[PDB]
Structures are given as structure tokens and as C-alpha cells.
Coordinates of N, CA, C and O in Angstrom, one line a residue:
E164 N -158.9 111.4 -67.4 CA -158.8 109.8 -66.9 C -160.3 109.8 -66.3 O -160.9 110.4 -65.8
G165 N -160.4 108.5 -65.5 CA -161.7 107.8 -65.0 C -161.1 108.5 -63.4 O -160.1 108.9 -62.9
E166 N -162.2 108.1 -62.6 CA -161.8 108.3 -61.1 C -161.1 107.0 -60.6 O -161.3 105.9 -61.1
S167 N -160.1 107.3 -59.5 CA -159.2 106.3 -59.0 C -159.2 106.4 -57.5 O -159.8 107.5 -57.1
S168 N -158.9 105.5 -57.0 CA -158.8 105.3 -55.1 C -157.5 105.0 -55.1 O -156.9 104.0 -55.8
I169 N -157.2 105.4 -54.0 CA -155.8 105.1 -53.1 C -156.0 104.6 -52.0 O -156.7 105.1 -50.9
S170 N -155.6 103.3 -51.6 CA -155.5 102.8 -50.4 C -154.2 101.7 -50.1 O -153.4 101.5 -50.8
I171 N -154.0 102.0 -48.6 CA -152.5 101.5 -48.1 C -152.8 100.9 -47.2 O -153.7 101.0 -46.2
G172 N -152.2 99.7 -46.7 CA -152.2 98.8 -45.7 C -150.8 97.9 -45.4 O -149.9 97.9 -46.0
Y173 N -150.5 97.2 -44.5 CA -149.6 96.5 -44.1 C -149.6 95.3 -44.8 O -151.0 94.6 -44.8
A174 N -148.3 94.9 -44.9 CA -148.1 93.4 -45.9 C -147.5 92.4 -45.0 O -146.1 93.0 -45.3
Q175 N -147.8 91.3 -44.4 CA -146.8 90.4 -44.1 C -147.0 89.1 -44.7 O -148.0 88.9 -45.0
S176 N -145.9 88.5 -45.2 CA -145.9 87.0 -45.6 C -145.6 85.8 -44.4 O -144.0 85.9 -44.5
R177 N -146.4 85.3 -44.1 CA -145.8 84.1 -43.1 C -145.2 83.0 -44.0 O -145.9 83.0 -44.8
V178 N -144.1 82.9 -43.7 CA -142.9 81.7 -43.9 C -143.0 80.7 -43.4 O -142.6 81.0 -42.4
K179 N -142.1 79.5 -43.6 CA -142.0 78.3 -42.8 C -140.4 78.2 -42.3 O -140.0 78.9 -43.6
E180 N -140.0 78.2 -41.6 CA -138.5 78.4 -41.5 C -138.2 77.8 -40.0 O -139.2 77.0 -39.0
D181 N -136.5 77.2 -39.9 CA -136.4 76.9 -38.8 C -136.8 77.0 -37.2 O -137.1 76.5 -36.4
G182 N -136.7 78.6 -37.2 CA -137.2 79.2 -36.2 C -136.9 81.0 -36.1 O -136.9 81.5 -35.1
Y183 N -136.7 81.2 -37.8 CA -136.6 82.6 -37.5 C -137.8 83.5 -37.0 O -139.0 83.0 -37.2
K184 N -137.4 84.6 -36.1 CA -138.7 85.2 -35.6 C -139.5 84.6 -34.7 O -139.5 83.3 -35.0
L185 N -140.7 85.0 -34.4 CA -141.6 84.3 -33.4 C -142.7 83.9 -34.8 O -143.0 82.5 -34.8
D186 N -143.3 84.7 -35.6 CA -144.3 84.6 -36.3 C -144.1 84.5 -37.7 O -144.7 84.1 -38.5
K187 N -142.4 84.5 -37.9 CA -142.0 84.2 -39.0 C -142.6 85.2 -40.3 O -143.0 85.0 -41.4
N188 N -143.0 86.1 -39.5 CA -143.8 87.3 -40.4 C -142.5 88.4 -40.9 O -142.6 89.3 -39.9
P189 N -142.4 88.8 -42.0 CA -141.8 89.7 -42.8 C -142.3 91.3 -42.6 O -143.7 91.0 -42.7
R190 N -141.6 92.0 -42.5 CA -142.1 93.7 -42.7 C -142.3 94.1 -44.1 O -141.2 94.1 -44.9
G191 N -143.8 94.5 -44.5 CA -143.7 95.0 -45.7 C -144.9 95.8 -45.9 O -145.5 95.9 -45.0
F192 N -145.0 96.7 -47.1 CA -146.1 97.4 -47.2 C -146.7 97.3 -48.6 O -146.5 96.6 -49.5
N193 N -148.1 97.4 -48.6 CA -149.1 97.3 -49.9 C -149.4 98.3 -50.3 O -150.2 99.0 -49.6
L194 N -149.5 98.4 -51.4 CA -150.1 99.9 -51.9 C -151.0 99.4 -53.3 O -150.7 98.7 -54.2
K195 N -152.4 99.9 -52.9 CA -153.4 99.4 -54.2 C -153.8 100.7 -54.7 O -153.9 101.6 -54.3
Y196 N -153.8 100.0 -56.0 CA -154.4 101.0 -57.1 C -155.5 101.0 -57.8 O -155.7 99.7 -58.5
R197 N -156.8 101.6 -57.8 CA -157.9 101.3 -58.4 C -158.2 102.3 -60.0 O -158.2 103.4 -59.5
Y198 N -158.4 101.3 -60.7 CA -158.7 102.0 -62.0 C -160.2 102.0 -62.5 O -160.7 100.8 -62.3
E199 N -160.6 103.4 -63.4 CA -162.2 103.3 -63.6 C -163.0 102.7 -62.4 O -163.7 101.8 -62.5
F200 N -163.2 103.3 -61.5 CA -164.3 102.8 -60.4 C -165.5 102.9 -61.0 O -166.0 102.0 -60.8
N201 N -166.2 103.8 -61.9 CA -167.1 103.6 -62.5 C -168.5 103.4 -61.5 O -168.5 104.0 -59.9
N202 N -169.1 102.2 -61.5 CA -170.1 101.2 -61.1 C -170.4 100.0 -61.3 O -170.3 99.2 -60.6
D203 N -170.9 100.0 -62.7 CA -170.7 98.5 -63.1 C -170.1 97.9 -62.9 O -169.9 96.6 -62.6
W204 N -168.8 98.0 -63.4 CA -167.4 97.0 -63.5 C -166.2 98.3 -63.2 O -166.3 99.4 -63.4
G205 N -165.1 97.9 -62.6 CA -163.9 98.4 -62.6 C -162.7 97.2 -62.3 O -162.9 96.1 -62.4
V206 N -161.6 97.8 -62.5 CA -160.2 97.0 -62.2 C -159.6 97.2 -60.9 O -159.6 98.4 -60.5
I207 N -158.6 96.3 -60.5 CA -157.9 96.6 -59.2 C -156.5 95.8 -59.3 O -156.3 94.5 -59.7
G208 N -155.4 96.4 -58.9 CA -154.1 96.2 -58.9 C -153.5 96.1 -57.7 O -153.7 96.9 -56.8
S209 N -152.8 95.3 -57.4 CA -152.3 95.0 -56.0 C -151.0 94.9 -55.8 O -150.2 94.2 -56.8
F210 N -150.1 95.9 -55.4 CA -148.6 95.7 -55.4 C -147.8 95.3 -53.6 O -148.6 96.2 -52.9
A211 N -147.1 94.7 -53.7 CA -146.8 94.5 -52.2 C -145.0 94.1 -52.4 O -144.4 93.5 -53.3
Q212 N -144.6 94.5 -51.3 CA -142.7 94.5 -51.2 C -142.3 94.2 -49.5 O -143.2 94.8 -49.0
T213 N -141.6 93.2 -49.4 CA -141.1 93.2 -48.0 C -139.3 93.2 -47.7 O -138.9 92.7 -49.0
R214 N -139.0 93.1 -46.8 CA -137.5 93.0 -46.6 C -137.2 92.4 -45.1 O -137.7 92.8 -43.8
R215 N -136.2 91.4 -44.8 CA -135.8 90.8 -43.7 C -135.2 91.8 -42.9 O -134.3 92.7 -43.3
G216 N -135.4 92.1 -41.6 CA -135.0 92.9 -40.7 C -135.2 92.7 -39.2 O -135.9 93.5 -38.7
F217 N -134.3 92.0 -38.5 CA -134.5 91.5 -37.4 C -133.1 92.1 -36.5 O -132.0 91.9 -36.9
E218 N -133.5 92.9 -35.4 CA -132.5 93.5 -34.4 C -131.3 92.0 -33.9 O -131.7 91.0 -33.8
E219 N -130.1 92.7 -33.9 CA -129.3 91.5 -33.8 C -129.5 90.9 -32.5 O -129.5 91.6 -30.9
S220 N -129.2 89.5 -32.2 CA -129.6 89.2 -30.5 C -128.5 87.7 -30.7 O -128.6 87.2 -31.6
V221 N -128.3 87.5 -29.5 CA -127.5 86.1 -29.4 C -128.1 85.0 -28.9 O -128.5 85.0 -27.3
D222 N -128.8 84.1 -29.7 CA -129.5 83.1 -29.5 C -128.8 81.8 -29.0 O -129.2 80.3 -28.9
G223 N -127.6 81.7 -30.0 CA -126.7 80.7 -30.2 C -127.4 80.0 -31.5 O -126.4 78.5 -31.9
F224 N -128.4 80.2 -31.9 CA -129.0 79.3 -33.3 C -128.4 80.4 -34.8 O -129.0 80.2 -35.4
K225 N -127.8 81.4 -34.3 CA -127.5 82.6 -35.6 C -128.9 82.6 -36.0 O -129.7 82.0 -35.7
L226 N -128.9 83.7 -36.9 CA -130.1 84.1 -37.4 C -130.0 84.2 -39.4 O -128.7 84.4 -39.7
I227 N -131.0 83.4 -39.8 CA -130.8 83.4 -41.1 C -130.8 84.4 -42.1 O -130.0 84.1 -42.9
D228 N -131.6 85.6 -41.7 CA -131.5 86.6 -42.2 C -131.5 86.6 -44.0 O -132.7 86.0 -44.5
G229 N -130.6 86.5 -44.8 CA -130.5 86.1 -45.9 C -130.5 87.3 -46.6 O -130.0 87.3 -47.5
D230 N -130.4 88.9 -46.0 CA -130.5 90.2 -46.6 C -131.3 89.9 -48.2 O -130.3 90.3 -48.9
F231 N -132.5 89.7 -48.2 CA -133.1 89.5 -49.9 C -134.5 90.0 -49.7 O -135.0 90.2 -48.6
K232 N -135.3 90.6 -50.7 CA -136.3 91.2 -50.8 C -137.2 90.1 -51.8 O -136.6 89.8 -52.8
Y233 N -138.5 90.4 -51.4 CA -139.5 89.7 -52.2 C -140.3 90.7 -52.5 O -141.2 91.4 -51.9
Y234 N -140.8 90.5 -53.8 CA -141.9 91.4 -54.3 C -142.9 90.4 -55.4 O -142.6 89.4 -55.9
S235 N -144.2 90.8 -55.3 CA -145.2 90.3 -56.0 C -146.3 91.2 -56.6 O -146.6 92.4 -55.8
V236 N -146.8 90.9 -57.6 CA -148.0 91.8 -58.4 C -149.0 91.1 -58.8 O -148.8 90.0 -59.8
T237 N -150.2 91.5 -58.7 CA -151.2 90.9 -58.7 C -152.7 91.9 -59.4 O -152.7 92.8 -59.4
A238 N -153.2 91.4 -60.3 CA -154.3 92.2 -60.8 C -155.6 91.2 -61.5 O -155.5 90.2 -61.6
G239 N -156.7 92.0 -61.3 CA -157.9 91.0 -61.9 C -159.2 92.3 -61.8 O -159.1 93.0 -61.2
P240 N -160.5 91.5 -62.5 CA -161.7 92.3 -62.5 C -162.2 92.6 -60.8 O -162.1 91.7 -60.3
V241 N -163.2 93.6 -61.1 CA -163.7 94.2 -60.2 C -165.4 94.1 -60.2 O -166.0 94.7 -60.9
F242 N -166.2 93.5 -59.5 CA -167.4 93.7 -59.5 C -168.4 94.0 -58.3 O -168.1 93.4 -57.3
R243 N -169.1 94.9 -58.4 CA -169.7 95.5 -57.3 C -171.0 94.1 -57.0 O -171.7 93.9 -57.6
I244 N -170.9 93.8 -55.7 CA -172.0 93.1 -55.1 C -173.6 94.1 -54.7 O -174.2 93.3 -55.3
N245 N -173.5 94.8 -54.0 CA -174.2 95.4 -53.7 C -174.5 97.2 -54.0 O -173.9 97.6 -54.9
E246 N -174.6 98.0 -53.0 CA -174.7 99.3 -53.3 C -173.2 100.0 -52.3 O -172.8 101.0 -52.4
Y247 N -172.9 99.0 -51.8 CA -171.3 99.4 -51.1 C -170.5 98.6 -50.6 O -169.6 98.6 -49.8
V248 N -170.7 97.7 -51.4 CA -169.9 96.3 -51.3 C -169.3 95.7 -52.5 O -170.3 95.3 -53.4
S249 N -167.7 95.0 -52.8 CA -167.5 94.7 -54.0 C -166.9 93.2 -53.6 O -166.2 93.4 -53.0
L250 N -166.6 92.5 -54.7 CA -165.8 91.5 -54.8 C -164.9 91.3 -55.7 O -165.4 91.3 -56.8
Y251 N -163.5 91.1 -55.4 CA -162.7 91.2 -56.6 C -161.6 90.0 -56.5 O -161.5 89.7 -55.2
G252 N -160.8 89.5 -57.2 CA -159.9 88.5 -57.2 C -158.7 88.9 -57.7 O -158.7 89.8 -58.9
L253 N -157.7 88.5 -57.2 CA -155.9 89.0 -57.4 C -155.5 87.5 -58.2 O -155.2 86.8 -57.5
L254 N -154.8 87.6 -59.4 CA -154.0 86.8 -60.1 C -152.7 87.5 -60.4 O -152.8 88.7 -61.1
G255 N -152.0 86.8 -60.4 CA -150.5 87.2 -60.9 C -149.3 86.1 -60.3 O -149.4 84.9 -60.8
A256 N -147.8 86.6 -60.2 CA -146.8 85.8 -59.8 C -146.3 86.5 -58.7 O -146.2 87.8 -58.6
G257 N -145.3 85.7 -57.9 CA -144.7 86.6 -57.1 C -142.8 86.1 -57.5 O -142.9 84.9 -58.1
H258 N -142.0 87.1 -57.2 CA -140.5 87.1 -57.3 C -139.7 87.3 -56.2 O -140.0 88.3 -55.6
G259 N -138.5 86.7 -56.2 CA -137.8 87.0 -54.9 C -136.4 87.3 -55.7 O -135.8 86.7 -56.7
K260 N -135.8 88.4 -55.0 CA -134.1 89.0 -55.8 C -133.5 88.7 -54.4 O -133.6 89.0 -53.2
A261 N -132.2 88.2 -55.1 CA -131.0 87.9 -53.6 C -129.6 88.4 -54.3 O -129.6 88.1 -55.3
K262 N -129.0 89.0 -53.4 CA -127.7 89.2 -53.9 C -126.2 89.1 -53.0 O -126.6 89.3 -51.8
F263 N -125.3 88.6 -53.5 CA -124.2 88.2 -52.5 C -123.1 89.5 -52.4 O -123.0 89.8 -53.5
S264 N -122.8 89.6 -51.5 CA -121.8 90.5 -50.9 C -120.5 89.9 -51.4 O -120.0 89.2 -50.3
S265 N -119.6 90.4 -52.3 CA -118.6 89.7 -52.6 C -117.7 91.0 -53.7 O -118.3 91.9 -54.1
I266 N -116.3 91.2 -53.6 CA -115.9 92.0 -54.8 C -115.3 91.1 -55.8 O -114.3 90.2 -55.8
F267 N -115.9 91.6 -56.9 CA -115.7 91.1 -58.1 C -115.6 91.6 -59.1 O -116.1 93.0 -59.3
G268 N -114.9 91.6 -60.6 CA -115.6 92.6 -61.4 C -116.3 92.6 -62.4 O -117.0 93.4 -63.0
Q269 N -117.5 91.7 -61.7 CA -118.7 91.5 -62.0 C -119.5 91.2 -60.7 O -119.1 90.9 -59.8
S270 N -120.8 91.4 -60.9 CA -121.7 91.2 -59.8 C -122.6 90.2 -59.8 O -122.9 89.4 -61.1
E271 N -123.4 89.4 -59.2 CA -124.0 88.0 -59.1 C -125.3 88.2 -58.5 O -125.7 88.6 -57.1
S272 N -126.6 87.6 -59.1 CA -127.5 87.8 -58.4 C -129.0 86.5 -59.1 O -128.6 86.6 -60.2
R273 N -129.8 86.5 -58.1 CA -130.6 85.1 -58.8 C -131.9 85.7 -58.3 O -132.5 86.3 -57.6
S274 N -133.0 84.9 -59.3 CA -134.3 85.2 -59.2 C -135.3 83.9 -59.3 O -134.9 82.9 -59.6
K275 N -136.2 84.4 -58.9 CA -137.4 82.9 -58.2 C -138.6 83.5 -58.9 O -139.0 84.4 -58.8
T276 N -139.1 82.1 -59.4 CA -140.6 82.4 -59.9 C -141.9 81.5 -59.2 O -141.4 80.6 -59.1
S277 N -142.9 82.1 -58.4 CA -143.4 81.6 -57.8 C -145.2 81.8 -58.6 O -145.4 82.8 -58.9
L278 N -146.1 81.2 -58.1 CA -147.7 81.7 -58.6 C -148.1 82.6 -57.7 O -147.7 82.0 -56.5
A279 N -149.1 83.3 -57.9 CA -149.5 84.3 -57.1 C -151.0 84.4 -57.4 O -151.6 84.7 -58.2
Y280 N -151.7 84.0 -56.2 CA -153.3 84.2 -56.2 C -153.8 84.4 -54.9 O -153.3 84.1 -54.0
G281 N -155.5 85.0 -55.0 CA -155.7 85.2 -53.7 C -156.9 86.2 -54.4 O -157.8 86.2 -54.9
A282 N -157.5 86.4 -53.1 CA -158.8 87.4 -53.2 C -159.0 88.8 -52.4 O -158.1 88.5 -51.2
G283 N -159.8 89.5 -52.4 CA -160.1 90.6 -51.5 C -161.5 91.0 -51.5 O -162.1 91.1 -52.7
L284 N -161.8 92.4 -50.8 CA -163.2 92.7 -51.0 C -163.3 94.2 -50.3 O -161.9 94.5 -49.3
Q285 N -164.1 95.0 -50.7 CA -164.0 96.3 -50.4 C -165.1 96.7 -49.7 O -166.7 96.6 -50.0
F286 N -164.8 97.5 -48.2 CA -166.5 97.5 -47.4 C -166.2 99.3 -47.2 O -165.1 99.7 -46.8
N287 N -167.3 99.5 -47.4 CA -167.8 101.2 -47.0 C -168.1 101.5 -45.8 O -169.9 101.8 -46.6
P288 N -167.8 101.7 -44.8 CA -169.0 101.8 -43.6 C -169.5 103.5 -43.6 O -170.7 103.8 -43.4
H289 N -168.5 104.3 -44.2 CA -169.0 105.9 -44.4 C -168.5 106.1 -45.9 O -167.1 105.7 -46.5
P290 N -169.4 107.2 -46.4 CA -168.9 107.9 -48.0 C -167.1 108.1 -47.8 O -166.9 107.8 -48.5
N291 N -166.6 108.6 -46.5 CA -165.2 109.1 -46.7 C -164.6 108.3 -46.1 O -163.2 108.0 -46.1
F292 N -165.1 107.1 -46.0 CA -163.9 105.6 -45.3 C -164.2 104.5 -45.7 O -165.5 104.1 -46.0
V293 N -163.1 104.2 -46.6 CA -163.3 102.6 -47.2 C -162.0 101.5 -46.4 O -161.0 102.0 -46.5
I294 N -162.7 100.5 -46.1 CA -161.9 99.4 -45.6 C -161.3 98.3 -47.2 O -162.0 97.8 -47.3
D295 N -160.0 98.5 -46.8 CA -159.6 97.4 -47.9 C -159.0 96.2 -47.2 O -158.0 96.1 -46.3
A296 N -159.2 94.8 -47.6 CA -159.0 93.7 -46.9 C -158.7 92.5 -48.0 O -159.3 92.2 -48.8
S297 N -157.1 92.3 -48.3 CA -156.9 91.5 -49.5 C -155.8 90.7 -49.2 O -155.1 91.0 -48.0
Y298 N -155.5 89.7 -49.4 CA -154.5 88.4 -49.4 C -154.3 87.7 -50.3 O -154.6 87.8 -51.5
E299 N -153.0 87.3 -50.4 CA -152.5 86.6 -51.6 C -151.3 85.2 -51.3 O -151.4 85.1 -50.0
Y300 N -151.4 84.4 -51.8 CA -151.0 83.1 -51.6 C -150.0 82.2 -52.7 O -150.5 82.0 -53.5
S301 N -149.0 82.1 -52.5 CA -147.8 81.1 -53.5 C -148.1 80.2 -53.1 O -147.6 79.5 -52.0
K302 N -147.8 79.3 -54.2 CA -148.0 77.6 -54.3 C -146.6 76.7 -54.3 O -146.0 76.9 -55.7
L303 N -145.6 76.6 -53.2 CA -144.1 76.1 -53.4 C -144.4 74.5 -53.0 O -145.1 74.4 -52.0
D304 N -143.8 73.8 -53.9 CA -143.7 72.3 -53.2 C -143.1 72.2 -51.7 O -143.6 71.6 -51.2
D305 N -141.9 73.0 -51.4 CA -141.3 73.0 -49.9 C -141.4 74.2 -49.3 O -141.7 74.2 -48.0
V306 N -142.1 75.3 -49.8 CA -142.3 76.4 -49.3 C -143.5 77.0 -49.0 O -144.2 77.0 -50.4
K307 N -144.4 77.4 -48.2 CA -145.7 77.5 -48.2 C -145.7 78.8 -47.9 O -145.2 79.5 -46.9
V308 N -146.4 79.9 -48.6 CA -146.7 81.3 -48.1 C -147.8 81.7 -47.9 O -148.7 81.7 -49.0
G309 N -148.0 82.6 -46.7 CA -149.2 83.1 -46.7 C -149.2 84.4 -46.4 O -148.1 85.2 -45.7
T310 N -150.0 85.3 -47.1 CA -149.6 86.9 -46.9 C -151.3 87.3 -46.8 O -152.1 87.3 -47.5
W311 N -151.3 88.5 -45.9 CA -152.3 89.3 -45.8 C -152.2 90.6 -45.5 O -151.3 91.1 -45.4
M312 N -153.4 91.3 -45.8 CA -153.4 92.9 -45.8 C -154.4 93.5 -45.4 O -155.5 93.4 -45.6
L313 N -154.3 94.4 -44.3 CA -155.0 95.2 -43.9 C -154.5 96.8 -43.8 O -154.0 97.2 -43.6
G314 N -155.8 97.2 -44.3 CA -155.9 99.0 -44.8 C -156.9 99.6 -44.9 O -158.0 99.0 -45.2
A315 N -156.8 100.9 -45.5 CA -158.2 102.0 -45.7 C -157.3 102.9 -46.6 O -156.6 103.1 -46.8
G316 N -158.9 103.4 -47.4 CA -158.4 104.6 -48.3 C -159.6 105.5 -48.7 O -160.5 104.9 -47.9
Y317 N -159.0 106.5 -49.4 CA -160.5 106.8 -50.0 C -160.8 107.1 -51.5 O -159.7 107.0 -52.3
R318 N -162.2 107.3 -51.6 CA -162.5 107.3 -53.1 C -162.2 108.8 -53.4 O -162.7 109.5 -53.2
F319 N -161.6 108.7 -54.6 CA -161.5 110.0 -55.6 C -161.7 110.3 -56.9 O -161.3 109.2 -57.4

């Protein structure tokens, strides 16, 4: 196969809420995979996932929590700008999953569909050091979602 690069970073999605957490930022991880690095052209895929997890505390306002997970996947073309920098765009869709805890002969689950788009760039200050910066945003009529990713990887 062609040359591939592995990069990892932290992923957080800012969401509007009544007062959950301070920055309303959930904890998640983003794994990036690049196929056909070549030089003239290439492609890049972005994967991210997160889950609510706040320590129990008595505020009197209860905790929304929700015990749910959010997944999103995007992909797009990559074009080198100079001799060590490239610009690429991410396009796809975001999905959310939720499960209710109860005892029944069957289980119940619901899914949601949202648009996913964003942009990212690759910067290599050193041959063996690459910094990846990508972000994603979903457009909902009532819910506004802001997501950013920060990490680094190595070229293989």
C-alpha cells in the first residue's frame, strides 16, 4: 500500500446547556488516518467520539448527564500548499446514540442525524514532528455545536 500517517489528539465539542459543566466541553478522543501521502495529492479521514462523565456533586440543580455518546465521521481531499504545509477540508455527518435503562423483553434506542463540516491543516516544524489541527461544526436549528482538535503525529 501507499505511505500512511498516524496522528492523535484531544477532541472536545462545545454545546449549549442550562449549566452543565463550566465550559460545557465533553471528553473525547480524535484519531486521524491519512492514506496515499504521496506529494501532489492525498486524502484524509477524521474520526471522533466523546461521552459525558462528570463527578457527582450536590449543586441543587441536578446534573443533566444523559449517559449518551456522540460519534462523527468526516473525509475530504488534501492538497499541499508549499514544501511542508497542506490545506484540507472535512465533510460528513454527525450521529448521536442514546439508550434508556429499563427492564423489558426488548431494548429501546434512538439516533439523530446532523450535518458535519469543518477544516484543518498540517504543519511540520521538523521532519519527525507533525502538528495536526482540525475542527468540526454541526448546524442545528436549536443546538449549536463547536468542536476543535489538537494533536501531533509521525509520517510513515
